[PDB]
Design a protein around this ligand. Structure first.
Ligand SMILES: CCCCCCCCCCCCCCCCCC(=O)OC[C@H](COP(=O)([O-])OCC(O)COP(=O)([O-])OC[C@@H](COC(=O)CCCCCCCCCCCCCCCCC)OC(=O)CCCCCCCCCCCCCCCCC)OC(=O)CCCCCCCCCCCCCCCCC
Ligand SMILES: CCCCCCCCCCCCCCCCCC(=O)OC[C@H](COP(=O)([O-])OCC(O)COP(=O)([O-])OC[C@@H](COC(=O)CCCCCCCCCCCCCCCCC)OC(=O)CCCCCCCCCCCCCCCCC)OC(=O)CCCCCCCCCCCCCCCCC
Ligand SMILES: CCCCCCCCCCCCCCCCC[C@@H](O)O[C@H](CO[C@H](O)CCCCCCCCCCCCCCC)COP(=O)(O)OCC[N+](C)(C)C
Ligand SMILES: CCCCCCCC/C=C\CCCCCCCC(=O)OC[C@H](COP(=O)(O)OCCN)OC(=O)CCCCCCC/C=C\CCCCCCCC
Lengths: 114, 97, 104, 121, 347, 51, 281, 140, 55
């Protein structure tokens, strides 16, 4: 077809760059050279748990807005429906709730981001 | 029914059996559940595309929404369970199955 | 308790989404609108129970309308038959270069 | 489900105009007064749970309870009789609808029929 | 969480069930459960305990997988009949799964294992609400799909719910887990008669809800939990223990009492169908269900476990925040027996 | 009717089951320089950062 | 639940519970504290402290109001009857109620209010009684489970002054003090008190007092009201022989409690004590 | 599957005892696999070889019970030649418990199993004779 | 033995014992998820085939 062809040529292109990236310099890897970087001095421990409520406390809100915009997408086509007064309220409606949701977060101090 | 549908349905059956074989930290289960969700979505949409039953073109996306929505909730609970342990299903306080 | 308040108040807020026909935007036909229409016109005062007897034929044709199940078993039987004749028969020359392109 | 889904009739109305024609239950139908005492005792337990000096206290609210349950009990009785009268009606109409399946069997007398006798021993 | 939000949640639960009881289209039913869930989890998380958290984890995890199987079986139904109206389903391989999904939603055995646990994890408020209001919606759809149910599959879970609702009830001390096995046992009686005659189901449902409202209002009134904790109450406010006795017996269905009305209509209905053996086993096991109500009665009212001294000061202080709805919930759940015929109001 | 294997298990807490709370011990600790451009070539500001 | 109409108070203050730790010096601590604060001073809230608020407002007999009697502690400590403990825990419950009597008032009028000794201070008497052996260890285990179960939810403490007096000097004032039972009290016990008291009580609590959300306060305010709730876990069933009572004595004594004029019924209703009959209509 | 019980159902009478006994053996094996399945599911065996040991146990036991039940029943049918009365199964019923009694190596459980398994089987036959519905259709 | 020890063994003590066994068996105290959850799995696998009705 068309698109699958360009996908294949792109991915094969990139993979080609990878293979010419590795199988080319042809020199000596060895231990400690291959040790992970840690601004000089060795790591105090392998990566573990950078825990934060302040991650999900907002990131989840991302997810629930993204679901909303998923409903916003039909709008350009819906605009040409025969009966806009039946539509228009809803076109506003969701946006209000979107805003409303945000507004609720805005001031329950649930939006501390960072 | 055309073989493709059978194949997606089977992908559902695996997307369930994976949820129920159910092992170690439970985050895998929220994944497997979302996979299940996706299989139901696709299996729906292929149908609404099939018969040109046009109104129902609205459903799959709406389906998706709530389904994604509950999963969006699910992580939050995991947080809490992750909050006291560093998650694993292997640790449950409640008694009597 | 199937409360049917939407019916008593006449809101119809749910009912529209039901059924293959039932008015769709720009009057786009369902793929199986006809068998469905007949089959529902068959279905009223008969109500549910006797309906699975008497209207069975209509629902059947509607089934084949949905799945095209039987026509596929047939068409499969033909295409599988043709392999047996593949050495004994050469099929049709035009498919390859007939008037089908002149046809329009 | 029966009765529900019956042709005609409308969903949520508590009681059809098609009723009305049935006589109302009389004011002192014993079932109804029993609804009375039911409310009464409920009104009493209302005191006993909350300590209270039972009976004499809150005779007010107690009267509220008995009036309450007798009141609802009334209409509930009306719908009761309506419903039973209804099934009786549908039943008879159906027995006229299919005379063949509800045969008017001939009634042989005892003299006409034999029946085995079992002596007690 | 401030009441103004709590009430919106609980009201959207009410809405999230009312929606199931209204809509005819399937998609709105699955939406009904789905909205019900999201609004059900947080209310379990008030006060919040290290325990409560994993309680909610249990509940969500099972309800989510149940809703998933349900939606799958709907889609399969549509694939083989192109409909959305409730009505009959048109493909048994789908129908059995809709039965399964609902079987989880009621908590019927052998899907039942989550219910005794979840109850343990929450306060008696959220507990009562979970054991009553959550039992409406899935039944609200089963009554609508009684027409095509595959009775074998229904009676098997309907029985096994009663045996498991029995044996797992003899074993426990703390009351909440026992209330869980009580309910898990009554659901067997509701879902049993469902293939044969739904009106008997709805009757039994009403009695069950009234009953468990009686109990949970009483446990709230005394803040008892573990059986021993209940034992002390005979000296402080003797009445309410002296009333737990009765409501328990109405759970047991000793015949003058109201709780006998369910069983004794059920036995009628099934008997018209012949099926004579099944109600005999069922009614015999219901006895086994009764027995731990009795033992629990022994801990409480009939006999006085030793009081602790510290109780004495508590004698001066009257209970407060009276729950208005309670006395009527006792009385209706007991004395109403010579008002069975009124059941026909339910048509 | 406890089994002895069950009898070994403790009775449930009368409220919050607080003891497990002692268990959380999450921490992280990490170092800037010397290389790090903000470390001016000669600083080792090790720090026990949270999230 | 009416908070929806007002979204809780924005006002704030502090209650003050002086922690004078002695015999006769205990009284001295109270006198300084009463003059010091505008809020009503804690009166000690001992055996009949509940009776003070009950309705009659008046002390009952020792037999049912507490069934402990302090004089019968000092005269025979290490009584075979576990009174040595039975008093301890009973006092703790009463003092807990003290908190509830006044902290609620803090959340109400918003005025400061002066407590006399408070719950955090009850750690120590038992802390010593266990050392002199007046009470067996299980009595203690019961005391700290009920401590953990009950105290933990009460969150804010403090706004209160610790104090000290010499053991020997208090022994001196004790001699001056009129009551015979107080004079009898042993020294080594009291020294063990002051030692553990200073060693731990101030050592922990001052760290919290040094720091001295509205929605949480409203939730806490609900807890202050309906005091049985604050008492709800104080009657935990653990069945130690000294605390626990057989059913006969309890059924009897409570059968005796109803005999009192103001206790048959909820206070507003009672006919025995001249509450208005008009409500009964 | 129902087709399997349907297989066992066409006895006929009790003729060819082996043909029947094989079917009963099949049913006993099926139930053994189910019980083993939930047992493994709810009692995590630890070390899987022990798990197959467990399932081998239950499967073989129930299969044995079914075998011996079936053949004693048909033999009694082909010997007493009554052959239709319920007691004709009951011996096998009583026999079945003893089989169960053997694997458990206990007189007690074997003794009880004899009586109750016997009565159950007798009720089954009685039911085939009387068309008892157990799961009656809604009919009403 | 006839009436204090067997006649009571034969039906009170029987049932009363069997419920001891069953009740400790069903209410197995544990409650690990993987257990009964996997049980939901196999009970579905059974529920589908045994009632599939079709051949
Ligand atoms: C003014 C305030 C006082 C008003 C009450 C006055 C007296 C009313 C009265 O009791 O008789 C009703 C009285 C006559 O009753 P009835 O219609 O002739 O039938 C009575 C027969 O017993 C026939 O009655 P029935 O056909 O209704 O039979 C009763 C039947 C159906 O009726 C019932 O179910 C009710 C029975 C339940 C108990 C009743 C509670 C006590 C009342 O129930 C049963 O047969 C079985 C009962 C179920 C037993 C359950 C297990 C029990 C253990 O009705 C009136 O109009 C009398 C009013 C006269 C003026 C009153 C002013 C005087 C001052
Ligand atoms: C070891 O052999 O010494 C005794 C050995 C020691 O017992 P235990 O360790 O004291 O108790 C825990 C059990 O081991 C293991 O039981 P569990 O406590 O681990 O599992 C509890 C489970 C019951 O435990 C099970 O193993 C499941 C049995 C389900 C039978 C369903 C048959 C339906 C066809 O309860 C349920 O919730 C069953 C759910 C409903 C199943 C049916 C649903 C159909 C839709 O007994 C067993 O391991 C299994 C007992 C089997 C009971 C029979 C159930 C009726 C069928 C012994 C010879 C067995 C003969 C096989 C039957 C012929
Ligand atoms: C937070 C705590 C949890 C709370 C949870 C408890 C909630 C309880 C809700 C109980 C539901 C009751 C239904 C009442 C709604 C009123 C609407 C009423 O008018 O419905 C009409 C029908 O009328 C109703 O039937 C009236 C029911 C009245 C309730 C009591 C009836 C008699 C009770 C019998 C038991 C004896 C006790 C009586 C003592 C007073 C229209 O319905 P219809 O379209 O026609 O058919 C619907 C399909 N059905 C029959 C299968 C449901
Ligand atoms: C299959 C399902 C059908 C069920 C079959 C019959 C069900 C009825 C029995 C239900 C309850 C049976 C036992 C429940 C309670 C129990 O197990 O008690 C055992 C207990 C042992 O002591 P513990 O509690 O462990 O602790 C001692 C501390 N001091 O002792 C008892 O209480 C046993 C005695 C009471 C039960 C006896 C009931 C009488 C017989 C029951 C059925 C008899 C059928 C009637 C005969 C007529 C035939 C049609």
């Amino acid at each position: 077809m068309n698109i699958m062809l360009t996908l294949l040529t792109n991915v094969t292109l990139a993979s080609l760059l990878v293979l010419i990236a590795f199988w080319l310099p042809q020199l000596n890897a060895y231990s400690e050279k291959t040790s992970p970087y840690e601004c000089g001095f060795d790591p105090m421990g392998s990566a573990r748990l950078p825990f934060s409520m302040k991650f999900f406390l907002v990131a989840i809100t991302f997810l629930l807005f993204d679901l909303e915009i998923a409903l916003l997408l039909p709008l350009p086509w819906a605009s040409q429906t025969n009966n806009l007064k039946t539509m228009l309220t809803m076109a506003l409606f969701l946006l209000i709730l979107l805003a409303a949701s945000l507004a609720y977060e805005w001031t329950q101090k649930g939006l501390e981001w960072a | 029914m055309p073989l493709v549908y059978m194949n997606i349905i089977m992908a559902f059956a695996i997307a369930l059996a994976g949820l129920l074989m159910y092992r170690s930290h439970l985050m895998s289960s929220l994944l497997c559940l979302e996979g299940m969700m996706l299989s139901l979505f696709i299996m729906s949409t292929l149908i609404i595309l099939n018969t040109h039953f046009t109104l129902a073109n609205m459903m799959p996306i709406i389906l998706l929404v709530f389904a994604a929505c509950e999963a969006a909730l699910g992580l939050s609970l995991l947080v809490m369970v992750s909050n006291t342990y560093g998650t694993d299903y292997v640790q449950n306080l409640n008694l009597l199955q | 308790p199937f409360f049917d308040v939407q019916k008593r108040l006449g809101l119809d807020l749910d009912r529209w989404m039901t059924i293959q026909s039932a008015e769709q935007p720009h009057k786009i036909p369902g793929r199986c609108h006809a068998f469905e229409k007949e089959w529902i016109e068959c279905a009223h005062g008969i109500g549910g129970i006797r309906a699975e007897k008497e209207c069975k034929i209509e629902f059947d044709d509607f089934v084949e309308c949905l799945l095209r199940q039987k026509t596929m078993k047939r068409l499969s039987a033909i295409k599988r038959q043709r392999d047996k004749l593949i050495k004994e028969g050469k099929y049709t020359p035009p498919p390859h270069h007939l008037g089908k392109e002149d046809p329009r | 489900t029966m009765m529900s889904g019956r042709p005609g009739r409308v969903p949520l109305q508590f009681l059809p105009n098609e009723a009305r024609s049935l006589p109302p239950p009389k004011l002192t139908d014993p079932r109804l007064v029993y609804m009375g005492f039911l409310g009464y005792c409920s009104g009493l337990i209302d005191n006993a749970i909350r300590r209270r000096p039972v009976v004499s206290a809150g005779l007010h609210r107690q009267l509220l309870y008995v009036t309450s349950f007798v009141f609802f009990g009334y209409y509930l009785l009306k719908r009761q009789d309506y419903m039973y009268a209804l099934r009786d009606h549908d039943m008879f109409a159906y027995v006229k609808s299919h005379p063949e399946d509800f045969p008017e069997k001939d009634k042989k007398t005892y003299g006409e029929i034999l029946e085995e006798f079992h002596p007690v021993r | 969480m401030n009441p103004i939000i709590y009430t919106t949640l609980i009201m959207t639960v009410m809405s999230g069930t009312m929606l199931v009881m209204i809509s005819s289209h399937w998609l709105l039913i699955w939406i009904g459960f789905e909205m019900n869930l999201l609004a059900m989890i947080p209310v379990l998380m008030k006060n919040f305990n290290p325990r409560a958290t994993e309680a909610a984890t249990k509940y969500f995890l099972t309800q989510a997988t149940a809703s998933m199987m349900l939606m799958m079986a709907i889609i399969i139904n549509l694939l083989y009949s192109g409909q959305w109206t409730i009505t009959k389903m048109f493909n048994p391989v789908a129908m059995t799964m809709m039965t399964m999904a609902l079987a989880m939603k009621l908590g019927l055995s052998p899907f039942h294992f989550w219910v005794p646990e979840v109850t343990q994890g929450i306060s008696l408020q959220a507990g009562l609400l979970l054991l009553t209001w959550q039992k409406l919606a899935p039944l609200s759809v089963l009554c609508q799909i009684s027409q095509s149910i595959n009775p074998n599959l229904m009676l098997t879970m309907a029985m096994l719910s009663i045996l498991i609702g029995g044996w797992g009830g003899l074993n426990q001390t703390q009351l909440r887990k026992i209330m869980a096995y009580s309910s898990i046992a009554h659901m067997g009686w509701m879902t049993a008669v469902l293939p044969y005659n739904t009106t008997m189901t709805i009757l039994n449902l009403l009695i069950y809800i009234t009953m468990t409202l009686a109990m949970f209002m009483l446990l709230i009134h005394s803040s008892a939990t573990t059986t021993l904790s209940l034992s002390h109450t005979w000296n402080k406010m003797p009445v309410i223990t002296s009333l737990m006795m009765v409501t328990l017996l109405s759970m047991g269905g000793l015949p003058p009492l109201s709780g006998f009305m369910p069983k004794w209509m059920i036995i009628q209905e099934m008997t018209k169908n012949e099926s004579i053996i099944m109600p005999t086993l069922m009614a015999m096991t219901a006895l086994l269900n009764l027995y731990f109500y009795m033992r629990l009665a022994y801990s409480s009212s009939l006999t006085m476990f030793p009081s602790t001294n510290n109780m004495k000061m508590k004698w001066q202080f009257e209970h407060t925040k009276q729950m208005k709805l309670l006395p009527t919930m006792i009385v209706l759940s007991t004395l109403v027996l010579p008002m069975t015929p009124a059941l026909s109001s339910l048509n | 009717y406890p089994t002895k294997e069950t009898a070994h298990w403790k009775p449930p807490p009368w409220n919050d089951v607080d003891p497990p709370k002692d268990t959380l011990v999450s921490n992280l600790t990490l170092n800037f320089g010397p290389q790090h451009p903000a470390a001016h070539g000669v600083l080792r500001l090790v720090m026990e950062l949270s999230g | 639940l009416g908070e929806r109409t007002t979204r809780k108070l924005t006002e704030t203050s502090k209650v003050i519970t002086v922690d004078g730790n002695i015999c006769s010096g205990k009284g001295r601590l109270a006198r300084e504290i009463a003059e010091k604060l505008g809020l009503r001073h804690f009166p000690e809230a001992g055996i009949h402290y509940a009776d003070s608020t009950t309705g009659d407002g008046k002390p009952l007999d020792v037999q049912l109001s507490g069934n402990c009697s302090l004089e019968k502690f000092y005269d025979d400590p290490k009584s075979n009857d576990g009174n040595s403990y039975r008093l301890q825990s009973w006092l703790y419950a009463s003092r807990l109620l003290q908190y509830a009597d006044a902290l609620e008032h803090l959340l109400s009028t918003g005025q400061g209010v002066v407590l006399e000794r408070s719950i955090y201070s009850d750690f120590v008497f038992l802390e010593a009684m266990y050392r002199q052996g007046f009470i067996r260890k299980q009595c203690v285990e019961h005391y700290n489970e009920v401590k953990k179960v009950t105290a933990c939810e009460y969150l804010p403490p403090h706004v209160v002054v610790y104090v000290d007096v010499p053991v020997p000097e208090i022994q001196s004032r004790i001699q001056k003090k009129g009551n015979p039972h107080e004079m009898k009290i042993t020294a080594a016990y009291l020294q063990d008190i002051e030692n553990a008291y200073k060693k731990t009580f101030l050592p922990e609590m001052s760290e919290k007092c040094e720091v001295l959300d509205d929605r949480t306060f409203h939730r806490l305010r609900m807890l202050v009201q309906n005091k049985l709730e604050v008492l709800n876990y104080t009657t935990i069933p653990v069945y130690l022989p000294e605390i626990t009572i057989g059913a006969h004595q309890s059924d009897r004594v409570f059968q005796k409690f109803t005999e009192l004029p103001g206790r048959k019924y909820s206070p507003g209703y009672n006919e025995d004590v001249g509450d208005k009959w008009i409500w009964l209509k | 599957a129902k087709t399997l019980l349907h297989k066992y159902s066409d006895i006929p009478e009790g003729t060819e005892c082996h043909r029947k006994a094989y079917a009963s053996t099949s049913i006993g094996g099926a139930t053994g696999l189910i019980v083993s399945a939930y047992s493994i599911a709810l009692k995590p065996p630890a070390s899987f070889l022990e798990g197959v040991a467990r399932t081998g146990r239950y499967t073989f036991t129930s299969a044995a019970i079914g075998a011996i039940f079936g053949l004693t029943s048909c033999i009694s049918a082909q010997v007493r030649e009554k052959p239709d009365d319920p007691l004709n199964y009951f011996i096998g019923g009583c026999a079945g418990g003893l089989t169960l009694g053997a694997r458990t190596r206990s007189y007690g459980i074997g003794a009880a199993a004899c009586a109750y398994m016997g009565l159950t089987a007798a009720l089954v036959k009685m039911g085939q004779l009387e068309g008892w519905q157990v799961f009656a259709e809604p009919k009403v | 033995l006839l009436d204090l020890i067997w006649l009571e063994t034969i039906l009170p003590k029987t049932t009363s014992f069997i419920q001891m066994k069953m009740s400790i068996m069903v209410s197995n105290q544990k409650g690990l998820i993987k257990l009964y959850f996997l049980s939901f799995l196999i009970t579905i696998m059974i529920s589908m085939t045994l009632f599939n009705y079709h051949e």
